[PDB]
Structures are given as C-alpha cells and as structure tokens.
Design a protein around this ligand. Sequence first.
Ligand SMILES: Cc1cc(F)ccc1-c1ccc(C[NH3+])cc1Cl
Ligand SMILES: Cc1cc(F)ccc1-c1ccc(C[NH3+])cc1Cl
Ligand SMILES: Cc1cc(F)ccc1-c1ccc(C[NH3+])cc1Cl
Length: 327
Amino acid sequence: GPVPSRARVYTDVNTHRPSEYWDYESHVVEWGNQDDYQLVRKLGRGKYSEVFEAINITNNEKVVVKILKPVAAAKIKREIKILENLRGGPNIITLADIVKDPVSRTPALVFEHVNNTDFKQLYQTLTDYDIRFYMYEILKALDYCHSMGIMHRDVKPHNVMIDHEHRKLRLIDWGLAEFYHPGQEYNVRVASRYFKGPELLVDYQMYDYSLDMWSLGCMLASMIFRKEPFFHGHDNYDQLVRIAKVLGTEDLYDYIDKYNIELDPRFNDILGRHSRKRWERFVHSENQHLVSPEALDFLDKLLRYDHQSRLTAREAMEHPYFYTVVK
Ligand SMILES: Cc1cc(F)ccc1-c1ccc(C[NH3+])cc1Cl
Ligand SMILES: Cc1cc(F)ccc1-c1ccc(C[NH3+])cc1Cl
Ligand SMILES: Cc1cc(F)ccc1-c1ccc(C[NH3+])cc1Cl
C-alpha cells in the first residue's frame, strides 16, 4: 500500500489550536440581515454559486454576494469557518457578512469588493517586474493560510482578483479549501485540470499545502512562457502525460516508487518514455522579456513531482526571483 506522507511545515497547527478552530461541523453561524444588501448585477455562476455585485445600504459601499447552491451542508460550513479563520490575513478576501437569501433559501456570503482588472489585459500586459510583484503578494496569502493549517486547493488565475490601479491582490474562492491534518486522506477531485498536482493525478490522497505550490508553478509557467495553459491536458490522464513530457518519466517513476503508488494501467497505452527537458527549451523571442535565470530556477523548485521536495511558500519568498521587488 501507499507510503504515508506528512507536510514538512505546519504539521502541528491544527493540534495546538483549540478544537473549535478546525471542527467546522460544530461551528454556529452568526446570521446577518439580508435587507442590508441590494443585488445590482449578476457577475457569474458556477457549479457551486451565483455571484452578484451588490450595495450595502447601511453605508452605500460595493460588496460581492456569493449565493450558494445547495450542496452537502459540510462544504458550506467548512468554507465559512475557513473564511472566518483567515479574515484579516494578508491578501485574503474579507468575508464581511453571512445572510440567508430569501429566494434561494441558502446562505449568501458577502465579501469586500475588489475592482478586478480585466484578466486578458493582465495576462497580456503585466511586466516582468509586475509578475514578480504579484507572485510575492500571492505567496503572502499562501504562507498565511498554510501557517493557519489550511490548504486552498484551487489556486488558479480566476481565483486571484487584482485591482491593478491600486496594486491590490486578493485570493478568493475558498469553497474547496480544507484544514490540513497529518495522516488525513483527502479527496483528489480538487483543483482545475491544468493546475492539478501530480499527487492528484496519480490518486495519492495524503497530500498537503504543497499542492498549492504546484498550482502556483503552473500559473507562473503559463505567464512567463506565454503558453496558456502550460500543461494542456485533454483529460486527467493526458494531464499527467503533458507533465511527463516536460519533467520526464524517470522522475515520475522515482516519485511513485518513493510512495509505493502504482499508476492506473490505462497509462501503458499513452505515457511512453520522455526525457526531462531543460526549462530554456520554452524560451523564445516573444517571451524572453519575462524570463530570467532567477525565474527559471524558481519555477524548477515549484514544478517538482515530489510534493515533499517543492519550495514552501515561506522559502519561495526568500528566492532571488523576488530580490527586485520593492518591499
Ligand atoms: C441556482 C440555484 C440552484 C439551486 F438548486 C437552488 C437555488 C439556486 C439559486 C436560486 C436563486 C438565486 C438568487 N438568490 C441563487 C441561487 Cl444559487
Ligand atoms: C499576476 C499573475 C502572475 C502569474 F505568474 C500568473 C498569473 C497571474 C494572474 C493573471 C491574471 C489574474 C486576474 N484574475 C490573476 C493572476 Cl494571479
Ligand atoms: C539566456 C538565458 C539562459 C538561461 F539559462 C536562463 C535565462 C536566460 C535569459 C537571460 C536574460 C533574459 C532577458 N529577460 C532572458 C533569458 Cl531567457
């Protein structure tokens, strides 16, 4: 059977905090007044919620309302508890209130509003300096939540709001976040396909905070190499093959052998044998302005099969790639 794994950092956080901190099923929700909020426009809808721009009529300030779709009550209580635990943390979205929507008959989470700059505009115009700057801001959010015993598990550009005019970044959508408990087996059906860590793709359930660092590396690779997404799988199986065409199959076998994981035999028809590639192979005249030896070294330390070998968020903050960023 699989060899167990533990995070190399923040293993004891949920042990030394009181049970009320992580026992989200026991949490009693403090309900606000739904009449304080007036929905202005629908911003979007996903499989878990409908999101609206709204106005808080007690102070005329813009807010964002996330009306939850009915799903297992445990998922709703977990997101609320995580948001309350992390409130006030660097670059963590602020949960302002929780109200009962009269129409949906479900909880509606009210958040601070972020004037989110167009994503296409950010992807197309962020400079080398801006990418370093915002990556450092995301690392502040991730080290904070990991230090608080929480893994986000859905790190991707759509979950990072940036108000570029005010150089303000917030990490949002904590609906897939979980408390990290050493030895716990987690559901591998988390994160969006292109951001899924190899641990999810090989069905290794005893993962930890380091899953977020893989997803962060996928974001950085796409951004600096101008290749959206960087690992472009047609499905979850082809997703691992796309990773193996860059990182190589020999290091993939070293990883699964270390943890006594067997690949699904369906990989025999599609995986093949691939050498590890040098990161310089992805550099060309249209992305060279965003690449540096420091960017490649940093990327190499995030995009590693072995989840225990990746840089932690706090180690990543010390990396030479961020020396140019004004602190
Ligand atoms: C979209 C959805 C799906 C459901 F199964 C139940 C409720 C809802 C829902 C209904 C109305 C609104 C607006 N208050 C929002 C939602 Cl999530
Ligand atoms: C600032 C950044 C840096 C990256 F390396 C990769 C992606 C992004 C990014 C691009 C657009 C958005 C807007 N939702 C957010 C982010 Cl984090
Ligand atoms: C030529 C090279 C080789 C590497 F191994 C890593 C980075 C670089 C490099 C150095 C400077 C720049 C300018 N922004 C770009 C690159 Cl790819």
